[PDB]
Amino acid sequence: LQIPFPMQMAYRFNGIGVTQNVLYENQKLIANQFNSAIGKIQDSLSSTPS
Amino acid sequence: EGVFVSNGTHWFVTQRNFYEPQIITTDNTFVSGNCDVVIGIVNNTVYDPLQPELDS
């Protein structure tokens, strides 16, 4: 069933107790944090040999 | 607890696993801030079961 990704994230937040307003009012910050984490994962896997 | 849906003309609120449309009232939604930062905001009139009852 198709669903917009912001609404999916709102459902995920509701799954841990956080309401939807926290995501809908801080969507840009959460998106930037997710992008930064995904970017750091690559260099973390590249640099660390173990 | 649900999701806003629309059949083209009117807006309804239903649960996330079964299409059960109902009028968007005050007891179905909660207020949190103003609509100036939410991306995807649409204008819609919410129902209040206190104004028609206070007609008497």
Ligand SMILES: *[C@@H]1O[C@H](CO)[C@@H](O)[C@H](O)[C@H]1NC(C)=O
């Ligand atoms: C949407 O639903 C409402 C109420 O059930 C109805 O009055 C309206 O005609 C419907 N719109 C369409 C396009 O079917």
Ligand SMILES: *[C@@H]1O[C@H](CO)[C@@H](O)[C@H](O)[C@H]1NC(C)=O
């Ligand atoms: C209708 O929505 C627009 C944003 O799409 C908003 O600027 C406008 O104020 C709304 N209308 C009313 C009467 O609030």
